[PDB]
RNA sequence: CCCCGAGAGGGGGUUUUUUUUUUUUUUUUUU
């Protein structure tokens, strides 16, 4: 099959199985990857879905391509062990995340430099015996933790929340918005989503600061 | 018959004797030991040579490595401020030829050479960790230079051993066998390049074919007779 | 018997993260 | 140990060789020292580009391991500090496996080591010493240690071994063990019995190689 | 009120004095006396064109002037360019030709002008004086062998551009003249580069003194006090230039002001981007020219 | 972004756009689009086609092809394929727009997938192939207009055989000449620019370069619908925005979209 | 596997002659039940360098 | 990595052509002597043209045919270049101009042409079939890679023998060669490539608008002649007097009648080459049988 | 064995044409002025091709720069909707396409005067919107037109044509149906000459028929050259009239 | 050979990394 990997025999077929509001809690850890400049572990467990993702920041490092007064940022999401997402969908979230942290990262302090942020969707279990929308706030939390752990300057602790397929990231005590995401959901439910997400944003920001300080 | 040597073998000469190390012989920077790193015939100069004996190994090779005081045939391939970019051998690291060094040199004065020209040049400086420098006129030359453009003719690829023998050994019959048939000029480079020109193309072509055949067989006896068949075939038409 | 023709193996894909993006390294 | 080799068979390469043991035939080529790519450049030492091509199909991860082990042998052999910021391309084209490639790569690796060494010699590249590699195997019913085993012997083996030693002083002094690749079930006593018999057959191989090298290269040189 | 204009079409991908003309490969002449110039090639007596255009005969020099092609630098042209890259002791600037033009560190007027001693430091620190993306006036000082241009800004007339907006038209619509910087009604000034690059800015004191501080000749800062009318004037002037270009008619200082006052019929400025207004405007410019004869 | 501008040009443009009476470089109003040209039904080999040309030379070509599939195994009945000339297939911009567009035209989100059903087992799979020849800004709205035009001039093959596989199970056979027009309601995608406190419809290239932020708002059935995405039009001047701006943008689209659709739904 | 899956052989025709592709049985894994892997624990080695 | 060619060498080789001289001493219409050596195993063939050295290896394994073609087996041809043939070649460069051309010439000469009977590679329809693979190894380059490969592939396919297979139901029984002899492949025709190299002794103007044609064409160019040519033509024929494929992908514009002359000249070469291949295959068969008789006798 | 009348006894083909007639050949110059220096939209039969010439301009990488000539690049984009049956996979890296791109480059390297544009790059982008036989010949005509529109110097026209051979009979300008039913020959002819820039035969052709097929193609290609030249002078003349 | 001072001063002639392979409609012989 592939000359760079061992994928086994081609006649083999994958094993297929047959048949015979809620509060959210998360766990935070930073700086456990010596390979890079900043890293974070974000684990969340709620209802019938738990998520364990890892973020890793590499930078500021050298940029071959062009001169720059300010810094350049790249974000890449990788599929984890079991749960899988479309490459398109991971690219879309990456673009959405780039826009957010281009409003938070003090790029002026890193001329001709590159800050490459990796987020590994290591373990995403779906226990219900576009799901990507519920993972977005946890990504922003991981990237924010990793950047702060790396020592990259941030204007403010960027956090987010999710409510009925709507994701919105806040800064400045929730006064302003650094990103807005909406899939599916209902009609004229903007005000309700903003309030619910700001509550999650506030809770995540407190736990993040608590993690960056005490730990 | 010769006394062949292989890398990792014991060096015959004793440390009590002052020895100038040539090609093939390596002096370890860490253990200070002198050891052979090439495979071939060991040559040691006789004693009495100003109290210094020169030892080296004659080994087979075709990839040239620039050394100071070598006559080489390069091809202009580039333009750089303050010099020409010249290539001694394909895929090898380029060498530099300054605009300053030329037969009637002037800082104001400039060379007329155009990329693609063959240059008979001497390598004055060859630092190991730095680009090779080639000069048409040499201080060693002391006002006499054979250096410069080669016009037309044909160039021939040849292993370093065959080229070295053609340049330094007078007992090599190749030049003589080619002189008993026709008269032409030849430039010889230690980088394994041989430039041949005659008045007519058929003669230059005949010389080209002979040098390659003789380089291939490496049987000193063959060429005078081998040359004879080559000259004949051209007139075959 | 104990000949190698009677034994199977697993097919592993090992990925090492070092902050780069591109083809599989020689290490992996 | 009735191997057969030829030197200087390729025209557009600085050095080449063709090593044959049994049914295992490998042809190797070496170009260098030459201009390296920027990503290959080493400020002080020589950069090695090592390529292994299989007898059937295209190069896979299998050959990537053959390239890696061959690198471990050739790297300390070459006096790399003689060629700073320079490149040496080393290509091995395995022409005939001489073994079940779906199970073993023993004989192909040893033959590649011997061929690469010969090609380096032909190319005239600075070497710190000499080298020889042999494949070894063990059989459970027999309990024997067979040097240079056949393909049929490998099928009924309990362990397979690649041994490559570094020789100096006219091929009499083992400077070091460049590579020992032992795979399968074996004990400590078997290992040293292997190393003792392996060193003997390796030393015999160097002597044979030294003969081949002198027989081919001497006609090129002058007296 | 109209939200948008959409023009539709079905079943089709797209809508659908004598001057000598010739195509590549066509035989132009068989007189070997001729000196073959650009756009041509020859074999013995036969001269063939090397491009699609009109045959030109100046004295004994036969050449074929192409219909189409990029801006070709001539020595002494007044061009407007953008810094593409900065290396060594030179600035490489995008003019709009086949190659980037060069701008050596020597040519430009350094801060403090004549009085300041020549400095080793400046070559290292040049980006601060100029950098990637900056616009500037420049004159084609010399030409390289291939045809590339060497620029210079050794004048107060030339230098970094500010206090305005950039727009470009095909270089064929702008020809050489005695001067390419012009003052227009509305207190704005146009810089019509021969390369087709145009700069519209608020009229400065220099622009007035042309027909009637040396430390800040490379400052990015726009004038702090720029009125809306000056801004709304720039928008109006720029649209009309695009309108003239849309008609494939070469720009004139007179044509511009004429169009600017004629466009006053339309209340909203954003009404100068539409094709109908441009088509009607183009005809207006041309009929007047015909009357002038 | 695409266009390269100096710091001075950007400062002038920003101040001009961030002004309380927002001044556009071309003199437009904060809701005025630039003139476009649309060609349709020029690819006879396909079921539907469109070609949109912008005023800045931006050009996009959309093709519509159909295929009979088993809707029990084929979940997605409408696949959007985006190809931007000069960009790799795995480029960030390409995949993002591809992922976005597929969500805009999902089977059960912004498209009446009932009109694609043939029988109780088989339905029409619609392949929307996008080819962006040239573009100087975010082409998401450009592509959207072309897809709309193409889907409104698409003609599919007509079924002949019975529509009950479960029992009789007849092989899907179609008429030799007659084709039924695809009646469907394609959604539109509008893109906005945020400069200071002003919101602009149809951002130009130079405008997007100095913008603080941007919005991607979908539109279907006379109302705002998902996907709704905030987007950085450039990456050097991206700033956070007040929530009222987000509500202003949604309101702005909600009142000017029917005007666009009206000019786009012309007979 | 299903006791008697309706899906049987698939007939493919050549240029005059006929052939039948053998019936492919869809193997299904049990949602719950499982057996442990039979590893030769005597052979499990551990790594060190 | 570039090959530097001096002006002197360029002018000399071209002027020699103007005097009916080529460096190797061959004739403009002279094809190099092709030497074919078979290894111990079937499908192992070594082709040599002067200094040019190529090696081909034919292999096969049990595989399943495509859904579209349930009666046809699988057949692929690999021609990956390596620095062994020269440092001019990048390792694994399978997208370069010359590489893709060569790859496409061979494919259109053997694969597309149906030189191999892929229908006879089927064991059980739509289930199991043979997958024949032709691996070409470019050892030493002195020009004529396309011609050397086409001969290497064809000689290999005609020399190769696959092990007998008996099939019952699902089960496959691969008989070893010793128990029963292996079975040869089915060859519908024998395609042979002949490559022509073109040289413009004058300038472009006299090529485009020049009255009398003067372009030089030589058969089977060496590396030096290959690096200085202005156009290439590869024509493939067989003993049945038919053109398998012709490929003049751009290059120096050439007279149509001259290209036709080349096709007729190539036909005389492919005839000699085909008969040559067949003879070397017979002798190889006679050699293996004579040893089989001397092995059974003593046994 | 074809059950359709590829060439009826009445000398008529499936589309109505005879043996010797070109298919509607409609050219179009300056179609994409804001996207390229030169552009052409080709309609040869049902074939629809957009051709863009971008250059001569600065190379994006100084590593890839020739100081003696311009770098000529050609990328052919055969869209997934070019043929009745939509192709699932892309053709961007398809070997068949790489050969086509390479072929086109090797054709115009000896026609376009790259020597007078040193230290520059000429990028040729092609988009095939619809395909119906003889796509190679149409690709040649599209590049020649677009290059001329860009004002890039070249020695002469290069006209492309395809000729099929059904039994004895030779069919000019074949479509997809005819190509599927017989072997075809693709010919590139320089100017009005008899010299071929491109000779392409991918299927079996008797050696005796090849010369006659070439003769038909060259004659047909000359007509393509005339149509290209005609439409070009027409576009030129109007521009001259309006500009002057 | 090229640009700036009127006379042997000065300034320029352009080097290096990123992402896998398919491909169109009842035997035998003469009759």
Q: Which domains can be identified in chain I, with CATH numbers?
A: 1-244 (3.30.230.70)
List the end-to-end C-alpha distance of chain C, in Å, as a whole number. 34
Question: CA gyration radius for chain C?
Answer: 16
For residue B108, say whether its CB is under 7 Å from any atom of strand J.
yes
**Angle of the H256-298 helix axis to the I210-243 helix axis, nearest 10:** 140
How many Å from the CA of E105 to C1' of J11?
Answer: 9
Residues in A touching C12 (Cβ below 8 Å): 6
CA distance F39 to F55: 15
Q: What angle do CA I147, I148, I150 make, to 5 degrees?
A: 65
Q: Would you say how long chain G is, in residues?
A: 49
State which nucleotides on strand J lie below 7 Å from a protein beta carbon.
1-4, 8, 11-25
β-bridge partners, B4: B41
3 state DSSP class of H188 = coil
Judge whether H21 is closer than 8 Å to chain B, CB to CB.
yes
The residues near H30 (Cβ < 8 Å, ≥ 6 apart) are H219, H220
* Cα E250 from chain centroid (whole Å): 11
Peptide bond preceding F188 in cis form (omega within 30 of 0): no
Question: CA gyration radius for chain A?
Answer: 19
Strands A176-182 and F223-230, sheet pairing: antiparallel
Cα separations (Å) of B197 from B119, B122, B169, E2?
14, 20, 21, 83
Judge whether G35 is closer than 8 Å to chain A, CB to CB.
no
- Greatest CA span in chain F, whole angstroms? 74
What secondary structure letter does DSSP report for H111?
I
Q: Which of A188, A213, A197, A187 is nearest to A162 (CA)?
A: A197
For residue H243, say whether its CB is under 7 Å from any atom of strand J.
no
Torsion of CA F25, F26, F27, F28, to 10 degrees: -110
CA distance B14 to I220: 86
How many Å from the CA of E234 to C1' of J12?
Answer: 39
CB contact under 8 Å between I151 and E52, yes or no, is yes
Cα separations (Å) of G24 from B109, E187, H95?
86, 84, 39
Cβ–Cβ < 8 Å for F244, F238: no
Cβ–Cβ < 8 Å for D107, D142: no
Q: Which of H280, H117, H282, H273 is nearest to H191 (CA)?
A: H273
Peptide bond preceding B190 in cis form (omega within 30 of 0): no
Give the CATH number of domain E19-71: 2.40.50.100
What secondary structure letter does DSSP report for B30?
T
For residue D38, say whether its CB is under 7 Å from any atom of strand J.
yes
β-bridge partners, D15: D30
Q: Which of G47, G6, G42 is nearest to G24 (CA)?
A: G6
Judge whether A17 is closer than 8 Å to chain E, CB to CB.
no
CB contact under 8 Å between I106 and H252, yes or no, is no
> For chain D, which residues make up each domain, given as ranges?
1-223
Q: Which of A201, A136, A191 is nearest to A171 (CA)?
A: A201
For residue I86, say whether its CB is under 7 Å from any atom of strand J.
no
**Strand stretches in F31-185, DSSP E:** 36-40, 48-53, 59-70, 78-84, 122-134, 155-159, 174-181
CA distance B127 to B96: 12
Backbone angles phi, psi at E183, to 5 degrees: -95, 135
Residues 127-146 of B with CB under 7 A from strand J: none
Q: Would you say how long chain F is, in residues?
A: 267
Judge whether C5 is closer than 8 Å to chain A, CB to CB.
no
Query: D59: part of which helix (H) or strand (E)?
Result: none
Cβ–Cβ < 8 Å for B55, B40: no
**Strand stretches in chain H, DSSP E:** 34-38, 44-49, 52-63, 74-78, 122-124, 128-140, 161-162, 165-168, 171-174, 183-184, 192-199, 216-219, 231-238, 242-248, 254-255
Residues in D touching H140 (Cβ below 8 Å): 10-13
Cβ–Cβ < 8 Å for E84, E132: yes
Q: Which of A99, F242, A175, F238 is nearest to A201 (CA)?
A: A175
3 state DSSP class of C16 = coil
Chains H and C touch (3+ CB pairs under 8 A): no
Strands E35-36 and F59-70, sheet pairing: unpaired
The residues near F163 (Cβ < 8 Å, ≥ 6 apart) are F118, F119, F120
Q: What angle do CA B83, B84, B87 make, to 5 degrees?
A: 140
**Burial tier of E16 (Cβ tally within 10 Å: 0-12, 13-18, 19+):** exposed
β-bridge partners, B109: none
Reported resolution, Å: 3.8
Q: Dihedral of CA D40/D45/D46/D50: which sign?
A: negative
Give the CATH number of domain F1-267: 3.30.230.70
Compute how many other C-beta atoms are within 10 angstroms of the C-beta atom of residue B228. 13
Q: Which of A21, A7, A11, A28 is nearest to A149 (CA)?
A: A28
CA distance A144 to I46: 56
* Cα E172 from chain centroid (whole Å): 9
Chains H and B touch (3+ CB pairs under 8 A): yes
Cβ–Cβ < 8 Å for H74, H86: no
β-bridge partners, E35: E61
Give the CATH number of domain D1-223: 3.30.230.70
Cβ–Cβ < 8 Å for G22, G10: no
3 state DSSP class of B148 = strand
Write down which chains contact chain E via at least 3 CB pairs under 8 A.
A, F, H, I
For residue E162, say whether its CB is under 7 Å from any atom of strand J.
no
Cα separations (Å) of H78 from F224, G4, H111, H132, H133?
56, 45, 12, 11, 8
CA distance H232 to H226: 9
Chains D and C touch (3+ CB pairs under 8 A): yes
Residues 68-87 of B with CB under 7 A from strand J: 79-81
Cα separations (Å) of H88 from A167, B118, D40, E154, I69?
55, 22, 17, 49, 21
Query: F189: part of which helix (H) or strand (E)?
Result: strand F188-195
CATH number for the domain spanning A156: value is 3.30.230.70
Cβ–Cβ < 8 Å for B207, B177: no
For residue B110, say whether its CB is under 7 Å from any atom of strand J.
yes
Domain annotation for chain B: domains and CATH numbers: 1-61 (2.40.50.100), 62-152 (2.40.50.140), 153-237 (3.30.1370.10)
The residues near A154 (Cβ < 8 Å, ≥ 6 apart) are A104, A105, A106, A144, A147, A148
Q: Which residue is nearest to nucleotide J13 (CA to C1')?
A: B81
Question: CA gyration radius for chain F?
Answer: 20
Torsion of CA E113, E115, E119, E122, to 10 degrees: -20
Residue A184: closest C-alpha in chain F: F226
Cβ–Cβ < 8 Å for H71, G14: yes
For residue I83, say whether its CB is under 7 Å from any atom of strand J.
yes
Residues in A touching E127 (Cβ below 8 Å): 67
Residues in B touching H10 (Cβ below 8 Å): 116
Residue G19: closest C-alpha in chain H: H125
Q: Which of F136, F2, F215 is nearest to A96 (CA)?
A: F215
> For chain F, which residues make up each domain, given as ranges?
1-267
**Strand stretches in H18-127, DSSP E:** 34-38, 44-49, 52-63, 74-78, 122-124
CATH superfamily of H1-299: GHMP Kinase, N-terminal domain (3.30.230.70)
Q: Which of B153, B200, B206 is nearest to B178 (CA)?
A: B206
Q: Dihedral of CA F7/F13/F16/F22: which sign?
A: negative
Describe the strand order of the beta sheet including F36-40 as a list of residue ranges: E6-10, F36-40, F48-53, F59-70, F122-134, F78-84
Determine the structural domain holding residue A123 and report its residue range. Answer: 1-215
Count of helix runs (H) and strand runs (E) in chain E: 6, 17
Residues of chain B with a following break (C to N over 2.5 Å): none
């Amino acid at each position: 099959q592939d000359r760079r990997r061992l994928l086994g025999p081609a006649a083999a077929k994958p094993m297929a199985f047959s048949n015979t509001e809620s509060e959210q809690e998360l766990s935070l850890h930073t700086g456990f990857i010596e390979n890079c400049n900043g890293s974070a572990l974000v684990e969340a467990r709620s209802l019938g879905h738990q998520t364990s993702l890892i973020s890793a920041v590499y930078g500021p490092r050298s940029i071959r391509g062009s001169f720059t007064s300010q810094g350049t940022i790249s974000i890449q999401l990788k599929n984890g062990l079991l749960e899988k997402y479309n490459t398109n969908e991971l690219k879309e979230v990456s673009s959405f995340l780039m826009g957010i942290f281009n409003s938070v990262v003090n790029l002026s302090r890193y001329p001709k430099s590159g800050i490459d942020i990796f987020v590994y969707l290591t373990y995403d279990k779906d226990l219900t015996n576009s799901q990507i929308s519920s993972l977005i706030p946890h990504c922003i939390t991981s990237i924010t933790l990793a950047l702060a752990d790396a020592g990259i300057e941030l204007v403010d602790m960027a956090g987010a929340g999710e409510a009925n397929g709507t994701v919105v990231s806040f800064i400045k005590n929730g006064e302003e918005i650094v990103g807005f995401w909406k899939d599916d959901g209902d009609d004229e439910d903007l005000l309700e989503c903003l309030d619910r997400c700001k509550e999650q944003y506030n809770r995540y920001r407190d736990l993040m600061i608590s993690c960056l300080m005490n730990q | 018959m010769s006394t062949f040597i292989f890398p990792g073998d014991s060096f015959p000469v004793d440390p009590t004797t002052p020895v100038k190390l040539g090609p093939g012989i390596y002096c370890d920077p860490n253990t200070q030991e002198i050891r052979p790193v090439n495979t071939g015939v060991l040559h040691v100069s006789a004693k009495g040579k100003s109290g210094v004996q020169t030892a080296y190994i004659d080994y087979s090779s075709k990839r040239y490595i620039p050394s100071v005081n070598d006559f080489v045939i390069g091809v202009i391939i580039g333009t750089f401020s303050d010099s020409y970019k010249v290539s001694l051998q394909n895929f090898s690291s380029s060498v530099s030829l300054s605009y300053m060094a030329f037969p009637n040199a002037s800082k104001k004065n400039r060379p007329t050479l155009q990329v693609g020209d063959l240059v008979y040049a001497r390598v004055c400086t060859a630092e190991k960790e730095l680009e090779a420098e080639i000069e048409c006129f040499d201080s060693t030359t002391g006002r006499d230079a054979g250096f410069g453009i080669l016009e037309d003719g044909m160039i021939i690829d040849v292993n370093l051993n065959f080229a070295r023998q053609l340049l330094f050994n007078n007992d090599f019959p190749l030049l003589k066998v080619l002189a008993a048939h026709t008269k032409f000029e030849v430039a010889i480079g230690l980088n394994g390049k041989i430039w041949v020109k005659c008045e007519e193309l058929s003669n230059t072509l005949a010389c080209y074919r002979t040098i390659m055949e003789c380089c291939q067989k490496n049987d000193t006896a063959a060429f005078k007779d081998i040359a004879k068949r080559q000259f004949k075939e051209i007139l075959t038409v | 018997e104990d000949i190698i023709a009677n034994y199977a193996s697993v097919y592993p894909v090992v990925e090492v993260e070092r902050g780069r993006v591109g083809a599989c390294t020689d290490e992996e | 140990m009735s191997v057969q080799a030829e030197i200087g068979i390729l025209d557009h390469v600085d050095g080449s060789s063709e090593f044959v043991s049994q049914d295992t035939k490998v042809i190797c080529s070496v170009t260098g020292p030459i201009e390296p790519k920027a990503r290959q450049e080493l400020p002080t030492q020589l950069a090695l580009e090592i390529i292994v091509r299989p007898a059937k199909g295209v190069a896979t991860t299998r050959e990537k391991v053959l390239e890696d082990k061959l690198r471990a042998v050739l790297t300390p052999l070459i006096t790399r500090h003689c060629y700073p910021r320079q490149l040496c391309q080393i290509t091995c084209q395995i022409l005939e496996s001489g073994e079940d490639e779906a199970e073993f790569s023993l004989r192909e690796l040893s033959c590649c080591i011997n061929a690469a060494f010969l090609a380096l010699v032909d190319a005239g590249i600075a070497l710190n010493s000499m080298c020889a590699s042999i494949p070894i195997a063990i059989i459970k019913d027999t309990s024997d240690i067979i040097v240079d085993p056949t393909a049929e012997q490998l099928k009924i083996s309990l362990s397979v071994h690649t041994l490559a030693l570094e020789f100096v002083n006219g091929g009499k002094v083992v400077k070091n063990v460049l590579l020992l690749d032992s795979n399968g079930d074996f004990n400590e006593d078997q290992l040293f019995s292997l190393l003792e018999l392996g060193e003997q057959k390796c030393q015999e191989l160097v002597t044979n190689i030294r003969r081949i090298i002198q027989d081919n290269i001497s006609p090129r040189l002058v007296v | 009120s109209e939200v948008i204009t959409i023009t539709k079409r079905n079943g089709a991908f797209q809508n659908s004095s004598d001057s000598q003309i010739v195509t590549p490969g066509e035989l132009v002449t068989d007189d070997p006396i001729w000196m073959r110039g650009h756009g041509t090639y020859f074999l013995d007596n036969m001269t063939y064109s090397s491009v699609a255009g009109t045959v030109s005969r100046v004295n004994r020099l036969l050449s074929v002037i192409p219909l189409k092609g990029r801006y070709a630098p001539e020595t002494g042209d007044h061009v407007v360019g953008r810094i593409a890259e900065v290396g060594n002791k030179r600035w490489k600037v995008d003019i709009g030709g086949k190659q980037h033009a060069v701008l050596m560190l020597g040519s430009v007027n350094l801060p403090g002008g004549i009085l300041r001693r020549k400095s080793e430091s400046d070559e290292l620190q040049m980006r601060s004086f100029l950098k990637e993306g900056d616009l500037l006036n420049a004159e084609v000082q010399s030409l390289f062998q291939d045809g590339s241009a060497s620029l210079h800004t050794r004048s107060l007339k030339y230098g970094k551009l500010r206090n305005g907006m950039f727009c470009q038209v095909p270089s064929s619509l702008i020809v050489r003249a005695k001067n390419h910087t012009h003052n227009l009604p509305g207190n704005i000034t146009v810089v019509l580069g021969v390369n087709g690059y145009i700069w519209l800015r608020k009229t400065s004191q220099m622009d007035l003194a042309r027909d009637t501080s040396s430390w800040q000749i490379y400052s990015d800062e726009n004038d702090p006090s720029i009125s809306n009318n000056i801004r709304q004037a720039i928008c109006r002037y720029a649209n009309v230039i695009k309108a003239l270009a849309f008609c494939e008619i070469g720009i004139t200082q007179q044509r511009i002001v004429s169009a600017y006052e004629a466009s006053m019929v339309y209340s909203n400025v954003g009404e100068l981007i539409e094709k109908n207004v441009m088509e009607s405007i183009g005809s207006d410019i041309l009929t007047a020219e015909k009357m002038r004869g | 972004g695409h266009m390269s501008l100096s710091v001075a040009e950007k400062s002038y443009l920003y101040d001009s756009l961030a002004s309380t009476p927002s001044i556009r470089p071309d003199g437009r109003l904060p809701h005025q689009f630039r003139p476009i040209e649309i060609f349709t039904d020029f690819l006879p080999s396909s079921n539907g086609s469109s070609r949109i040309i912008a005023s800045d030379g931006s050009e996009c070509i959309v093709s519509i092809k159909s295929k009979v599939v088993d809707h029990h195994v084929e979940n997605e009945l409408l696949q959007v394929d985006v190809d931007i000339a000069g960009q790799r297939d795995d480029a960030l911009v390409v995949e993002t727009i591809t992922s976005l567009l597929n969500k805009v035209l999902k089977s059960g989100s912004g498209v009446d997938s009932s009109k694609l059903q043939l029988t109780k087992k088989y339905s029409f799979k619609i392949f929307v192939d996008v080819l962006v020849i040239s573009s100087h800004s975010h082409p998401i709205s450009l592509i959207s207009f072309a897809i709309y035009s193409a889907l409104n001039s698409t003609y599919l093959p007509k079924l002949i055989s019975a529509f009950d596989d479960l029992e009789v199970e007849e092989l899907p056979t179609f008429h030799d000449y007659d084709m039924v027009k695809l009646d469907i309601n394609p959604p539109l995608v509008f893109i906005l620019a945020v400069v200071g406190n002003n919101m602009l419809l149809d951002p130009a290239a130079n405008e997007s370069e100095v913008a603080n932020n941007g919005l991607i708002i979908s539109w279907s059935n006379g109302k705002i619908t998902s996907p709704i995405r905030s987007v950085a039009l450039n990456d050097s001047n991206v700033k956070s925005f007040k929530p009222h701006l987000l509500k202003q943008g949604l309101a702005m689209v909600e009142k000017y979209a029917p005007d666009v659709v009206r000019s786009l739904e012309n007979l | 596997i299903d006791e008697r899956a309706s899906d049987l052989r698939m007939t493919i025709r050549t240029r005059g002659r006929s052939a039948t592709i053998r019936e492919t049985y869809e193997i299904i894994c049990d949602q719950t039940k499982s057996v442990p892997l039979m590893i030769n624990a005597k052979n499990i080695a551990f790594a060190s360098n | 990595k570039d090959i530097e060619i001096s002006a002197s060498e360029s002018k000399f080789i071209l002027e020699a052509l103007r005097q009916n001289y080529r460096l190797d001493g061959r004739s403009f219409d002279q094809f190099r002597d092709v030497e074919i050596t078979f290894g111990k195993e079937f499908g192992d063939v070594s082709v040599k043209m002067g200094n040019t050295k190529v090696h081909c290896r034919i292999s096969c394994q049990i595989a399943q045919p495509y859904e579209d073609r349930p009666f046809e087996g699988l057949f692929v041809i690999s021609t990956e270049i390596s620095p062994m043939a020269g440092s001019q070649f990048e390792n694994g460069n399978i997208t370069g101009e010359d590489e893709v051309l060569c790859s496409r010439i061979i494919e259109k000469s053997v694969r597309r042409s149906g030189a191999l009977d892929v229908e006879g590679l089927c064991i059980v329809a739509g289930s199991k079939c043979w997958a024949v693979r032709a691996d070409v190894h470019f050892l030493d380059c002195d020009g004529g890679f396309i011609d050397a490969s086409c001969i290497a592939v064809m000689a290999g396919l005609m020399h190769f023998k696959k092990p007998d297979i008996t099939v019952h139901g699902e089960q496959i029984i691969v008989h070893p060669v010793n128990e029963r002899e292996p079975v040869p492949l089915g060859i519908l025709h024998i395609p042979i490539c002949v490559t022509f190299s073109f040289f413009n002794p004058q300038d472009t103007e006299e090529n485009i608008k020049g009255e009398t044609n003067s372009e030089i064409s030589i058969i089977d160019a060496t590396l030096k002649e290959e690096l200085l040519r202005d156009g290439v033509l590869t024509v493939t024929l067989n003993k049945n007097r038919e053109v398998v494929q012709v490929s003049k992908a751009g290059g120096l514009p050439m007279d149509a009648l001259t290209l036709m002359k080349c096709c007729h000249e190539a036909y005389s070469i492919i005839e000699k080459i085909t008969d040559q291949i067949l003879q070397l295959l017979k002798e190889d068969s006679e050699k293996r049988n004579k040893y089989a008789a001397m092995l059974t006798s003593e046994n | 064995m074809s059950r359709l009348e590829i060439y009826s006894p009445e000398g008529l083909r499936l589309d109505g044409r005879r043996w010797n007639e070109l298919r509607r050949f409609e050219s179009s110059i300056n179609t994409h002025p804001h996207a390229a220096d030169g552009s052409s939209y080709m309609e040869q039969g049902n074939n629809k091709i957009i051709t863009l010439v971008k250059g001569p301009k600065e190379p994006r990488l100084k590593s890839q720069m020739d100081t003696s000539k311009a770098l000529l690049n050609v990328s052919v984009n055969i869209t997934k909707f070019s043929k009745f049956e939509r192709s699932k996979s892309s053709h961007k890296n398809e070997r068949r396409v790489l050969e086509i791109q390479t072929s086109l480059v090797r054709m115009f390297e000896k026609n376009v005067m790259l020597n007078i544009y040193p230290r520059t790059v000429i990028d040729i982008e092609i988009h095939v919107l619809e395909q119906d036989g003889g796509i190679m010949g149409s690709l040649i005509n599209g590049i020649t037109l677009a290059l001329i529109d860009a004002g890039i110097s070249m020695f002469d026209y290069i006209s492309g044509i395809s000729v099929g051979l059904y039994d004895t009979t030779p069919l000019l300008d074949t479509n997809s149906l005819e190509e599927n039913a017989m072997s075809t020959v693709t010919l590139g002819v320089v100017g009005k000459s008899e010299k071929l820039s491109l000779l392409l035969v991918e299927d079996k052709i008797p050696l005796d028929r090849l010369e006659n097929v070439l003769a038909i193609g060259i004659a047909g290609a000359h007509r393509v050259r005339d149509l290209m030249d005609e439409e070009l002078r027409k576009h030129a003349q109007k521009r001259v009239s309006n500009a002057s």
